[PDB]
Amino acid sequence: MRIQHNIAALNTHRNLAANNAAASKNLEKLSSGFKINRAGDDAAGLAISEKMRGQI
Amino acid sequence: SGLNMASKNSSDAISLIQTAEGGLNETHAILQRMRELAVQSRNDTNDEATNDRSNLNDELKQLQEEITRISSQMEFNNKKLLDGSQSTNGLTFQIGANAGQTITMKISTMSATKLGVDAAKASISKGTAASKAIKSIDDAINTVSKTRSALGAVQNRLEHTINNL
Amino acid sequence: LNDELKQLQEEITRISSQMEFNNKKLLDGSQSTNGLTFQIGANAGQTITMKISTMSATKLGVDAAKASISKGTAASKAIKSIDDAINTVSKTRSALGAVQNRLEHTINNL
Amino acid sequence: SATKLGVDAAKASISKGTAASKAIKSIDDAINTVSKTRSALGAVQNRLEHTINNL
Amino acid sequence: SGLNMASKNSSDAISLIQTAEGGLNETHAILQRMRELAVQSRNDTNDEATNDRSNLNDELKQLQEEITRISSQMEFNNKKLLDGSQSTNGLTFQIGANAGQTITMKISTM
Amino acid sequence: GTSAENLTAAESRIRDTDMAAEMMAFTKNNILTQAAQSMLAQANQQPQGVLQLLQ
């Protein structure tokens, strides 16, 4: 309730970690120049891109 | 304590999955290169006599050794992933404090023999063999795309799991 | 995309039947039969009853047996099915938040 | 070397008109062989590039 | 989310349509060439004996093989367009967030 | 050539990213990170009730 646990700081830490992760993802997308670097980014579209690259 | 440790374990699983996906990206790349080589070999401007296609076959054989090498030299914490070790039973991640709160996962063998692109069935010595090699390479590209999708789905699931935890 | 969808359906079921407070499953249908009773008063009978519905994929008509996206046609129904599910879970969240806001005033009065 | 490729002076002189006939074919064979070797090297180079990316 | 994805889908449809139009531009071109060949063949200066018109027929047959080739070797994402595949039911584009906000399209055999 | 250009455009629109949107998102996320940092610095100082005990 008072000392042993400070829940506001925990919530703030969570949100801070999430924001840092999102900024890192954006940095990856900007440095790479591609919007899809992993399949977790977009599954339907990775396959399409690979087939289109083969066709090109 | 269980929930925090499960968050840690989920992050570890995400790291493993990222390793496997990064392994398969180069498989995609060299498969594209192999398809380009086959489409070039397929034309009749090239002569078997003066060794025009045997150089593209040199290139193709080296890329096949590399596609096998990436398969059976990939590891996370001394654990071979893309060989068929996990295709028998599967990797189990504890994503919960209590017992039974698990998820099972499986990764298939991604060598040249399994995908029908090894040199015993995908040579480009001839003009005829390149015809089959093109289709064989397309099938392999589609299969490895499918596997990458299967990995990314579990990654995206684990993210939501971490948030909930 | 169906791989992705199936994994998300396993997760929506997992959150339902792996949620607990003090070894008490909440989002399964355990409390939908009789309900949780909170004593918010010194004397007997000064209680409030509460109920939480089953929030699995089967109850909301979004499980894989009725929400595949293998075809183009099935995605048409899946969109509407997902909208209905979102509205239902919003309704349930509202029902919970109302009781929370009530309990705050109750604490002040106590 | 020239000895291995059959183009050394002991077998590829052009003193005569006849010897140049054989010298032309000998030089063609040597060009093809060294092209083959260059291809063999370039393949390993291209492999090592992908290896570096994966690493 | 639905509106942004519908924008993406509409752009994809535009790409497909551009592919088909680019395919038909060369059909126009070789049809013009074939008409020129026929108008030249039509005159009586040319002899069937010494193979004057059979060479224009060689040219014409090759251009007919090309007009068929463009038809049944055109594709977008492994989807034959100018064969009659879509002339039976048609391609449906989702250009809206909700269900039913679609447009159907059809392409004939060329 | 026409087909290659069209498919290249399609693949670019599918996979490549727009620099402006990602720049926007990155700036937004940095600002949010700074805000959360300041909020945490405040929240760590919030529990100071030592003046109850001593004097």
Author numbering:
A (entry chain A): 1 to 56
B (entry chain L): 57 to 221
C (entry chain Q): 112 to 221
D (entry chain G): 167 to 221
E (entry chain F): 57 to 166
F (entry chain A): 222 to 276
What do the authors say?
The flagellar filament is composed of the protein flagellin that assembles into linear protofilaments. The 11 flagellar protofilaments twist into a supercoil that can vary in rise and handedness, a phenomenon termed polymorphism. Each protofilament can exist in the so-called L- or R-state, depending on the conformation of its composing flagellin monomers. Kurthia is a Gram-positive bacterium belonging to the Firmicute phylum.
We analyzed wild-type, mostly curved flagellar filaments projecting from motile Kurthia bacteria by transmission cryo-electron microscopy. Helical reconstruction resulted in a map with a maximum resolution of 2.6 Å or better of the most ordered parts and an overall resolution of 2.8 Å (EMD-10362). A comparison of the 3D structure of flagellin from Kurthia (276 amino acids) and the published structures of L- and R-conformations of B. subtilis (304 amino acids) show that all share the same overall fold, including five helices and two β-hairpins, but that the loops before and after the β-hairpins were shorter in Kurthia. Kurthia flagellin was present in a conformation that was most like the L-state as encountered in B. subtilis. Initially, five 3D classes were identified, which upon helical refinement (including the refinement of the helical parameters) produced good quality potential maps that were so similar that combining the five classes significantly increased the resolution. The electron scattering potential map of the functional Kurthia filament showed six extra densities corresponding to O-glycosylations of threonines and serines. Our data indicate that wild-type Kurthia flagellin was present in just one single conformation, and formed nearly parallel protofilaments, irrespective of flagellar curvature.
